[PDB]
Amino acid sequence: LQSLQTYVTQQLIRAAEIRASANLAATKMSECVLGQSKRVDFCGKGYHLM
Amino acid sequence: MAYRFNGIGVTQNVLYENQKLIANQFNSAIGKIQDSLSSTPSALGKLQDVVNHNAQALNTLVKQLSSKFGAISSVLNDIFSRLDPPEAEVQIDRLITGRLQSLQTYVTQQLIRAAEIRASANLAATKMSECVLGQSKRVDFCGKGYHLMSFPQSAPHGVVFLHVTYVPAQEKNFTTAPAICHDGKAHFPREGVFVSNGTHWFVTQRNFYEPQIITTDNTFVSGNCDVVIGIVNNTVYDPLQPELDS
Amino acid sequence: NTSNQVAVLYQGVNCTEVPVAIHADQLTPTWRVYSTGSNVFQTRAGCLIGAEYVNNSYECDIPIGAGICASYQTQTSQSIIAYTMSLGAENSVAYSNNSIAIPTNFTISVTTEILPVSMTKTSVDCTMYICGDSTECSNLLLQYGSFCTQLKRALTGIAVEQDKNTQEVFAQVKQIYKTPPIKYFGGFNFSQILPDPSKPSKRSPIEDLLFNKVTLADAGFIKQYGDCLGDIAARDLIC
Amino acid sequence: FSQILPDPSKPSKRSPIEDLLFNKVTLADAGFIKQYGDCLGDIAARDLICAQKFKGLTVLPPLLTDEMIAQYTSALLAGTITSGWTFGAGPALQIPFPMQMAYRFNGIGVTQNVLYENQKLIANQFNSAIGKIQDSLSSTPSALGKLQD
Amino acid sequence: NTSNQVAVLYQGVNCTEVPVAIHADQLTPTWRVYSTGSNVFQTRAGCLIGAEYVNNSYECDIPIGAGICASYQTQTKSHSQSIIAYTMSLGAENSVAYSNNSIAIPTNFTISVTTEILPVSMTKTSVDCTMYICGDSTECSN
Amino acid sequence: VVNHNAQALNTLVKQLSSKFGAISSVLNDIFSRLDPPEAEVQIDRLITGR
Ligand SMILES: *[C@@H]1O[C@H](CO)[C@@H](O[C@@H]2O[C@H](CO)[C@@H](O)[C@H](O)[C@H]2NC(C)=O)[C@H](O)[C@H]1NC(C)=O
Ligand SMILES: *[C@@H]1O[C@H](CO)[C@@H](O[C@@H]2O[C@H](CO)[C@@H](O)[C@H](O)[C@H]2NC(C)=O)[C@H](O)[C@H]1NC(C)=O
Ligand SMILES: *[C@@H]1O[C@H](CO)[C@@H](O[C@@H]2O[C@H](CO)[C@@H](O)[C@H](O)[C@H]2NC(C)=O)[C@H](O)[C@H]1NC(C)=O
Ligand SMILES: *[C@@H]1O[C@H](CO)[C@@H](O[C@@H]2O[C@H](CO)[C@@H](O)[C@H](O)[C@H]2NC(C)=O)[C@H](O)[C@H]1NC(C)=O
Ligand SMILES: *[C@@H]1O[C@H](CO)[C@@H](O)[C@H](O)[C@H]1NC(C)=O
Ligand SMILES: *[C@@H]1O[C@H](CO)[C@@H](O)[C@H](O)[C@H]1NC(C)=O
Ligand SMILES: *[C@@H]1O[C@H](CO)[C@@H](O)[C@H](O)[C@H]1NC(C)=O
Ligand SMILES: *[C@@H]1O[C@H](CO)[C@@H](O)[C@H](O)[C@H]1NC(C)=O
Ligand SMILES: *[C@@H]1O[C@H](CO)[C@@H](O)[C@H](O)[C@H]1NC(C)=O
Ligand SMILES: *[C@@H]1O[C@H](CO)[C@@H](O)[C@H](O)[C@H]1NC(C)=O
Ligand SMILES: *[C@@H]1O[C@H](CO)[C@@H](O)[C@H](O)[C@H]1NC(C)=O
Ligand SMILES: *[C@@H]1O[C@H](CO)[C@@H](O)[C@H](O)[C@H]1NC(C)=O
Ligand SMILES: *[C@@H]1O[C@H](CO)[C@@H](O)[C@H](O)[C@H]1NC(C)=O
Ligand SMILES: *[C@@H]1O[C@H](CO)[C@@H](O)[C@H](O)[C@H]1NC(C)=O
């Protein structure tokens, strides 16, 4: 029983991190595509075109 | 309202000529929110679950109390009254270890859930600070389409935002050219693009049809009529000519 | 609450093997009709029994796997249906060398978004939950160390952060303003969001409609001792 | 733009760069699932993918298959190349490419008269960059470390 | 570092049974006389003993629940500094006279500087299992 | 950040003093007093507790 529970706990933590990345990617889909962005070096290096 | 429009490309003169047709549309749009909220039973689901979890796990913990954990009985008084010390400690240790281990699971799950809610609240704080106390050009960050204004409202353990947005509706075809040619020189438009209905040529804004007559007061000069591709010859008007003929 | 039909999915098995299960055979699940097949389907996730396949595509409601969804609609007087997902409506764009398109008239819309901001606070008592007013249980418990010393801190962390969240979200302005006594604004109409003086409480119609659409848990704590002794002898979960 | 648009000749409508991206990354096994009758015979290629299925640990296929992912992601490239950014708000509006690029330069404080004066110079540069990127994804496999972990 | 007086809070009680809320009639006389309720106050979160209720308003220091707070003051009496509890106040009440044909414009400006602080990393640590679990006993090693 | 962790490192030392219901906290006394056949009934509690 113990050797099961520990495993589950680890999974939960990892889940959070992955979401913390995916929720970032969505924003980069809707601010550096579908439009131009003036935030400095948010996408690429130097000024941004496409 | 005019200054709000000015930030997304629409010229200041549009609003002052269409005031009533905007006021009525805004009132009609506000009038639908009650029905929109009342239509779907899952309008507030994102809040409801937040309660249910914390109103459920606790219950399970109480139901946890019935396990005997490999002892001979569940209630604690029976072990004390029915048996003798030299092994009663051996009997008790199982129950104490089981319950002390059970409580930690609840503690850890509460930590993780609070850790998630902290991030959600931080995102809500950014939305409140950026999209009701100014204006944002980040596309799709606040609402769908372009952004004008927002209004907040409170609710049990949460907030609801109302966003106001501006959307073009009806569109028309046109034939265009990149630059214009005259007397060996080439003219470019300061803002907007050249639009021709098949008979003449005009300039216009990028988001609302409003023709004007081409002059030297809204274009400028660069290069020469040789390099650009697709250029078309035409005429150019000068405002000082009909005034200097006197 | 609506119907009584069911469908079964066997996970990741070639359901030619499924007929092995037999009602009279030594086995706990021994259902008859779903073991055999009158209309069966095969998916990369397993085998589906009880469903009827249809080629017409709809925006699907409940998921199964491998891009297959099930739904309940009046086909022919009605039975459950499974189908492949529909990506969405399609269009086309008339690209050209020297053609443009521009708008001529505008419309205004309003949209709604919802966000949670905090969670309910809680507290536990270490000794009562583990001994239940036993006498020497406390003596036997005092030896094991300091779990009861640190659980309280672990919970107090959340109990103190849950108020910092709300204090930070709603306090971006210091002063307190108020609307002018006259509600004229050149044509618009804000009577649905401003607070209503006639209500005995300082609230607004949208907030009032919101408050009654969520079932908050029991609370009030005005008086608690001896409540479940009298007319609440039918014990409620809270006490 | 022939190096990032789908090729109808390919069996499953995958862009050439996507083939290199899939083949560089290695999965746990050639197939996502090992069905009940697949592992009856102890072929040497049978790894831990199905040996642990006897202990109640299972994996499940995801909801959206890769083909639907490709169909979604081709739509964005189709939209951006032919309509600019305006299709992220309402009805789509067509507009020729060069004026879109002119708008892009005007966005960052360079008067558009530059673009129309050097158009043929820009293309010969741009096409050189894309053709390089493939080599940059074949020199070393250290670029895609994260997707392995 | 300042004084010695304290205040006691009982949670979720009609403390009209304060001798019964805690069976102090079997405890020390000091808690017995602190249970007499010299001057009690009632809040939605319970009741408070050892402080006086005031009709003023201030921003508060020590949170207590249900929008009440408590602090330590000296100006209430002639000198005899004591603990008080009061309802928290949000801030100054101000209004702007709206009018449909008049605006305001600034004439003079100023420059300010402000500070922000952020943690970037925590310290690094490591633990050994075998040495800590028993500490040099071969029987544990087995 | 400097404070909390330090405290979280001190308490782990103090838990080394609790007896966990065994005969004695010191690990050498059990092997210097009891016999090999029966010390295993006691060592298990300490091992699990730590
Ligand atoms: C844009 O189109 C709208 C239609 O959405 C038109 O609004 C008309 O407004 C008048 C006065 O309120 C109504 O009597 C008409 O019935 C509306 N038209 C329709 C089709 O219902 C109008 O052509 C344009 N309005 C603006 C503000 O640009
Ligand atoms: C104006 O342009 C639009 C968009 O380019 C045209 O809309 C479609 O154009 C395609 C061209 O292949 C036709 O097949 C469709 O029938 C058109 N309509 C729709 C609803 O898709 C439009 O035809 C052009 N002209 C007008 C008067 O709108
Ligand atoms: C502002 O709008 C609200 C709602 O659209 C108006 O209030 C409604 O007025 C109608 C009369 O036409 C009544 O039948 C409803 O019962 C009212 N509802 C509510 C919630 O008040 C209000 O009259 C409008 N204000 C102005 C100045 O026109
Ligand atoms: C704007 O306000 C500043 C205050 O910081 C004024 O600056 C002071 O002006 C007085 C009046 O001559 C001087 O004696 C001070 O030395 C100035 N500096 C400071 C730091 O006080 C400034 O004059 C104001 N603007 C105008 C146009 O008068
Ligand atoms: C183009 O607009 C001019 C404006 O005066 C008008 O005279 C002409 O008839 C229009 N031609 C077409 C084809 O719309
Ligand atoms: C446009 O007019 C100019 C006269 O300045 C002429 O040189 C040029 O060839 C003309 N172009 C076309 C396409 O007729
Ligand atoms: C259950 O179904 C009946 C009729 O089909 C309906 O009136 C009722 O509202 C349904 N239950 C709920 C909770 O909606
Ligand atoms: C499943 O069984 C059918 C026969 O019923 C057979 O034709 C097919 O190849 C089998 N597939 C797998 C993956 O076992
Ligand atoms: C659905 O399409 C398949 C493939 O064309 C066909 O065999 C089947 O008969 C269709 N379903 C119906 C109900 O016609
Ligand atoms: C667009 O112009 C190019 C050359 O500039 C030509 O090859 C192509 O056929 C033209 N297409 C249309 C639709 O005019
Ligand atoms: C307990 O306090 C509440 C506070 O409002 C009061 O209404 C109630 O009457 C009190 N109970 C008793 C038994 O006095
Ligand atoms: C304090 O306020 C309460 C509530 O209005 C009032 O009953 C009481 O008389 C006030 N005390 C003084 C000294 O004014
Ligand atoms: C300017 O007008 C506001 C009302 O709009 C008023 O409160 C203020 O006192 C006026 N300024 C001065 C210097 O009186
Ligand atoms: C400004 O408000 C006054 C007060 O109601 C009103 O009489 C006047 O008509 C308003 N101005 C305009 C332009 O409507």
Attribute tags:
binds 2-acetamido-2-deoxy-beta-D-glucopyranose; mainly alpha; 1 helix; 6 chains; binds a molecule of 2 linked components (NAG-NAG); 0% strand; 6P; part of a larger assembly; 50 residues; Spike glycoprotein; viral protein
> Which descriptor suits the 3D outline of chain A?
rod-shaped
The oligomeric status of these chains comes to part of a larger assembly
- Helical coverage of chain A, percent range: 55-70%
Say which molecules are bound, naming each kind only once: a molecule of 2 linked components (NAG-NAG), 2-acetamido-2-deoxy-beta-D-glucopyranose
State the distance separating the first and last CA atoms of chain A. 53 Å
Disulfide bonds (chain C): 15-47, 60-69, 126-148, 131-137, 228-239
Site (Cleavage) (chain C): 203-204
Region (Disordered) (chain C): 19-38, 216-239
Glycosylation sites (chain C): 1, 14, 55, 74, 97, 105, 189
